mmCIF file of C-alpha atoms in Angstrom:
data_model
loop_
_atom_site.group_PDB
_atom_site.id
_atom_site.type_symbol
_atom_site.label_atom_id
_atom_site.label_comp_id
_atom_site.label_asym_id
_atom_site.label_seq_id
_atom_site.Cartn_x
_atom_site.Cartn_y
_atom_site.Cartn_z
ATOM 1 C CA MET A 23 -0.294 4.202 -26.539
ATOM 2 C CA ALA A 24 0.744 7.542 -28.022
ATOM 3 C CA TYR A 25 2.980 8.251 -25.027
ATOM 4 C CA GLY A 26 3.926 6.914 -21.597
ATOM 5 C CA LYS A 27 4.474 3.445 -23.053
ATOM 6 C CA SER A 28 7.280 4.260 -25.493
ATOM 7 C CA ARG A 29 9.539 1.234 -25.062
ATOM 8 C CA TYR A 30 6.976 -0.496 -22.856
ATOM 9 C CA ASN A 31 4.075 -0.991 -25.253
ATOM 10 C CA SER A 32 2.327 -3.207 -22.710
ATOM 11 C CA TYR A 33 2.974 -4.445 -19.178
ATOM 12 C CA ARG A 34 4.548 -7.834 -19.868
ATOM 13 C CA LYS A 35 4.806 -8.620 -16.155
ATOM 14 C CA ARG A 36 1.076 -9.266 -15.806
ATOM 15 C CA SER A 37 -0.883 -12.293 -14.595
ATOM 16 C CA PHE A 38 -3.289 -11.773 -17.496
ATOM 17 C CA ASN A 39 -5.966 -13.198 -15.196
ATOM 18 C CA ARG A 40 -9.675 -12.364 -15.171
ATOM 19 C CA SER A 41 -12.168 -11.457 -12.448
ATOM 20 C CA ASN A 42 -14.349 -14.351 -11.296
ATOM 21 C CA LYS A 43 -16.502 -12.603 -8.697
ATOM 22 C CA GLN A 44 -19.845 -10.805 -8.907
ATOM 23 C CA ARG A 45 -20.092 -7.066 -8.261
ATOM 24 C CA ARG A 46 -22.378 -7.877 -5.332
ATOM 25 C CA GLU A 47 -19.505 -9.387 -3.357
ATOM 26 C CA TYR A 48 -17.324 -6.350 -4.031
ATOM 27 C CA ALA A 49 -20.148 -4.004 -3.047
ATOM 28 C CA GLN A 50 -20.593 -5.838 0.250
ATOM 29 C CA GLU A 51 -16.858 -5.656 0.907
ATOM 30 C CA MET A 52 -16.873 -1.925 0.198
ATOM 31 C CA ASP A 53 -19.534 -1.283 2.834
ATOM 32 C CA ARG A 54 -17.575 -3.357 5.340
ATOM 33 C CA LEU A 55 -14.396 -1.471 4.481
ATOM 34 C CA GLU A 56 -16.107 1.893 4.940
ATOM 35 C CA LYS A 57 -17.412 0.825 8.344
ATOM 36 C CA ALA A 58 -13.917 -0.169 9.459
ATOM 37 C CA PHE A 59 -12.567 3.226 8.402
ATOM 38 C CA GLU A 60 -15.316 4.994 10.338
ATOM 39 C CA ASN A 61 -14.195 3.293 13.545
ATOM 40 C CA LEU A 62 -10.555 3.361 12.442
ATOM 41 C CA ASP A 63 -8.828 6.178 14.316
ATOM 42 C CA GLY A 64 -6.056 7.825 12.298
ATOM 43 C CA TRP A 65 -7.518 6.558 9.018
ATOM 44 C CA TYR A 66 -9.012 8.706 6.269
ATOM 45 C CA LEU A 67 -10.749 8.006 2.956
ATOM 46 C CA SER A 68 -10.778 10.186 -0.154
ATOM 47 C CA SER A 69 -13.427 9.951 -2.869
ATOM 48 C CA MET A 70 -11.033 11.434 -5.421
ATOM 49 C CA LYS A 71 -8.453 8.715 -4.807
ATOM 50 C CA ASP A 72 -10.784 6.106 -3.287
ATOM 51 C CA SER A 73 -8.062 5.082 -0.842
ATOM 52 C CA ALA A 74 -7.249 4.967 2.869
ATOM 53 C CA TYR A 75 -4.150 5.968 4.826
ATOM 54 C CA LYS A 76 -2.940 6.339 8.409
ATOM 55 C CA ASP A 77 -0.580 8.985 9.767
ATOM 56 C CA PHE A 78 1.605 8.516 12.841
ATOM 57 C CA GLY A 79 2.629 12.172 12.898
ATOM 58 C CA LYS A 80 6.114 11.192 11.738
ATOM 59 C CA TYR A 81 5.323 9.683 8.342
ATOM 60 C CA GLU A 82 2.415 9.069 5.971
ATOM 61 C CA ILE A 83 1.341 5.583 4.897
ATOM 62 C CA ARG A 84 -1.545 4.607 2.629
ATOM 63 C CA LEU A 85 -3.159 1.376 1.469
ATOM 64 C CA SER A 86 -4.643 0.537 -1.922
ATOM 65 C CA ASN A 87 -6.538 -2.253 -3.669
ATOM 66 C CA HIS A 88 -4.884 -4.884 -5.847
ATOM 67 C CA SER A 89 -4.064 -2.057 -8.247
ATOM 68 C CA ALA A 90 -1.037 0.040 -7.316
ATOM 69 C CA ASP A 91 -1.108 2.298 -10.372
ATOM 70 C CA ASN A 92 -2.289 5.078 -8.061
ATOM 71 C CA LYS A 93 0.407 4.467 -5.450
ATOM 72 C CA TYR A 94 2.455 7.176 -7.158
ATOM 73 C CA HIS A 95 1.782 10.816 -6.300
ATOM 74 C CA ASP A 96 3.241 14.237 -7.092
ATOM 75 C CA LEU A 97 2.712 15.515 -3.548
ATOM 76 C CA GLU A 98 5.346 15.166 -0.831
ATOM 77 C CA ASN A 99 4.897 15.847 2.881
ATOM 78 C CA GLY A 100 8.645 15.901 3.500
ATOM 79 C CA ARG A 101 8.250 12.632 5.394
ATOM 80 C CA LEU A 102 8.928 9.008 4.482
ATOM 81 C CA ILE A 103 6.197 7.297 2.476
ATOM 82 C CA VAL A 104 4.980 3.706 2.627
ATOM 83 C CA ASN A 105 3.134 2.001 -0.217
ATOM 84 C CA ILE A 106 0.870 -0.812 0.962
ATOM 85 C CA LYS A 107 -1.071 -3.077 -1.386
ATOM 86 C CA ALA A 108 -3.917 -5.255 -0.118
ATOM 87 C CA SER A 109 -7.335 -6.563 -1.144
ATOM 88 C CA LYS A 110 -10.409 -4.717 0.120
ATOM 89 C CA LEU A 111 -11.787 -7.961 1.545
ATOM 90 C CA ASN A 112 -8.531 -8.604 3.397
ATOM 91 C CA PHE A 113 -7.911 -4.888 3.899
ATOM 92 C CA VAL A 114 -8.711 -5.105 7.610
ATOM 93 C CA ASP A 115 -6.559 -8.215 7.931
ATOM 94 C CA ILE A 116 -3.612 -6.536 6.187
ATOM 95 C CA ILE A 117 -3.617 -3.580 8.589
ATOM 96 C CA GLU A 118 -3.870 -5.819 11.638
ATOM 97 C CA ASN A 119 -0.575 -7.528 10.832
ATOM 98 C CA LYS A 120 0.893 -4.739 8.713
ATOM 99 C CA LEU A 121 0.416 -2.221 11.493
ATOM 100 C CA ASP A 122 2.059 -4.639 13.915
ATOM 101 C CA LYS A 123 5.010 -5.022 11.549
ATOM 102 C CA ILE A 124 5.524 -1.271 11.411
ATOM 103 C CA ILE A 125 5.114 -0.807 15.155
ATOM 104 C CA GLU A 126 7.646 -3.535 15.934
ATOM 105 C CA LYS A 127 10.026 -2.288 13.256
ATOM 106 C CA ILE A 128 9.785 1.285 14.513
ATOM 107 C CA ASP A 129 10.523 0.095 18.047
ATOM 108 C CA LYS A 130 13.920 -1.320 17.085
ATOM 109 C CA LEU A 131 14.564 1.456 14.592
ATOM 110 C CA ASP A 132 12.645 4.413 13.169
ATOM 111 C CA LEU A 133 11.110 3.845 9.738
ATOM 112 C CA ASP A 134 12.257 7.348 8.824
ATOM 113 C CA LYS A 135 15.744 5.896 8.424
ATOM 114 C CA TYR A 136 14.761 4.370 5.096
ATOM 115 C CA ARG A 137 14.242 6.911 2.323
ATOM 116 C CA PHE A 138 11.796 4.607 0.533
ATOM 117 C CA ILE A 139 9.832 1.765 2.096
ATOM 118 C CA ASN A 140 7.110 -0.453 0.688
ATOM 119 C CA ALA A 141 4.789 -3.134 2.052
ATOM 120 C CA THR A 142 3.214 -6.042 0.185
ATOM 121 C CA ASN A 143 0.257 -8.358 0.778
ATOM 122 C CA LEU A 144 0.678 -10.719 3.729
ATOM 123 C CA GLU A 145 1.483 -13.483 1.245
ATOM 124 C CA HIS A 146 3.991 -11.176 -0.425
ATOM 125 C CA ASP A 147 7.262 -10.151 1.216
ATOM 126 C CA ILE A 148 8.024 -6.671 2.542
ATOM 127 C CA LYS A 149 11.327 -4.810 2.370
ATOM 128 C CA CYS A 150 12.728 -1.317 2.893
ATOM 129 C CA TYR A 151 15.728 0.547 1.486
ATOM 130 C CA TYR A 152 17.923 2.978 3.416
ATOM 131 C CA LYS A 153 18.406 5.156 0.332
ATOM 132 C CA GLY A 154 15.657 3.556 -1.745
ATOM 133 C CA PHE A 155 18.313 1.524 -3.522
ATOM 134 C CA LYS A 156 21.228 -0.383 -2.007
ATOM 135 C CA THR A 157 22.461 -3.784 -0.855
ATOM 136 C CA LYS A 158 21.316 -2.819 2.643
ATOM 137 C CA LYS A 159 17.602 -3.350 3.240
ATOM 138 C CA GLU A 160 15.242 -4.550 5.970
ATOM 139 C CA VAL A 161 12.605 -7.266 5.636
ATOM 140 C CA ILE A 162 9.967 -8.613 8.016
#
């Protein structure tokens, strides 16, 4: 807490919940997730940032577990970036509908139009900003 928390000593906006599942279930999900990535064309996994992402050649999008503390990066590809949060168990499910949402959205208008875009769990709502901040935004 020496630094990086200054004013924010602790993340107040937290569910303060606790895990109620055995590591066995998570381990099984991990193997399933890895298998999906193996047969998932355009998807890559990194051990350093245990995460997966898919590139369309126009922009880079990546998915992460329930934790989004790693969604931030200091590397830019010069292309729009999409932050997607989803559970490993429902990871496959999130891409099935999430991918569809992006494909449909890109059809009507390129996603490159929005400087900053972000996706949320199926239950959560998704929205994009033209300049990353403004009254004008898109939601699906």
